[PDB]
Design a protein around this ligand. Structure first.
Ligand SMILES: Nc1nc(-c2ccc3c(N)[nH]nc3c2)cc(N2CCOCC2)n1
Length: 277
């Protein structure tokens, strides 16, 4: 392995993302002219807030992932005050940006991008890993317009915390208990959001959102691809064990075989040319 890199190895530029405990900065490594998304974390703040386990889990998970639909951790280093994670740079940014830009996706784009997310999840879940906070902000777009899912500090590694309110599954609001089905619920929301342009559970505040979730209080616009709607209904199911794609439903076989994916070739998605938005 190469020498431990250092801040002076890079020319830093614009800010790509911001979280409570981190900032993502675009940086060009000088010796290679490669662009990386460097995630910068202030040690003191992490310790002060008891986030060390989250930072640790992210590093450990993003190292174990080796798949085109996931942002990669290439390296790490630190100075006196800060940790640096060198991440894949997804030039086109958040999927959320595109949902806003174009309003909502047509069937073909919905189909392609949903299949990529399913395929990513299948890989993630195959490694006994749960994202727990899947959302359009987390689903980045590469320069070639394929997805790269990021942000893994809140993931769980199958042998406490609540993600973004709108994508939170009912079981989290009723037991503090998560599983692969939690990601599948989020998948249901995200699909709904690609088609309708908005997330299925909206309200004035988090409490009300949570109220709708446990009540399964949402509904479909009249202009909602029927097969997409049928799939969404098989995902947004209160009982976590009855969600298409989960182990009690026999996994990703039946999920990938859903009529909505009729025209999908699952094996080489990443090699296919994404439909234009
Ligand atoms: N892992 C992780 N990645 C990113 C991130 C953001 C933009 C990126 C890009 N354009 N290429 N790569 C990127 C990675 C942010 C993040 N934060 C931000 C929000 O707070 C939660 C954690 N965490």
């Amino acid at each position: 392995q190469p020498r431990k890199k250092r801040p002076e190895d890079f020319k830093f530029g614009k800010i790509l993302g911001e979280g409570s405990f981190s900032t993502v900065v675009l940086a060009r490594e000088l010796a290679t002219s490669r662009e990386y998304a460097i995630k910068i974390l202030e040690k003191r703040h992490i310790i002060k807030e008891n986030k060390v386990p989250y930072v640790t889990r992210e590093r450990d998970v993003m190292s174990r992932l080796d798949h085109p639909f996931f942002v990669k951790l290439y390296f790490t280093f630190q100075d006196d005050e800060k940790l640096y994670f060198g991440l894949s740079y997804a030039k086109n940014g958040e999927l959320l940006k595109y949902i806003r830009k174009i309003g909502s996706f047509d069937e073909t784009c919905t189909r392609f991008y949903t299949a990529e997310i399913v395929s990513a999840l299948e890989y993630l879940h195959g490694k006994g890993i749960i994202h727990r906070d899947l959302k359009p902000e987390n689903i980045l777009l590469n320069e070639d317009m394929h997805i790269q899912i990021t942000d893994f500090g809140t993931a769980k590694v199958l042998s406490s915390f609540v993600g973004t309110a709108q994508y939170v599954s009912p079981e989290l609001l009723t037991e503090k208990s998560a599983c692969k089905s939690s990601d599948l619920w989020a998948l249901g929301c995200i699909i709904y959001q690609l088609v309708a342009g908005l997330p299925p559970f909206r309200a004035g505040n988090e409490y009300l959102i949570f109220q709708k979730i446990i009540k399964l209080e949402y509904d479909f616009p009249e202009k909602f691809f029927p097969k997409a709607r049928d799939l969404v209904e098989k995902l947004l199911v209160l009982d976590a064990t009855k969600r298409l794609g989960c182990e009690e439903m026999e996994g990703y076989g039946p999920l990938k075989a859903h009529p909505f994916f009729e025209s999908v070739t699952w094996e080489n998605l990443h090699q296919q040319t994404p439909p234009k938005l």
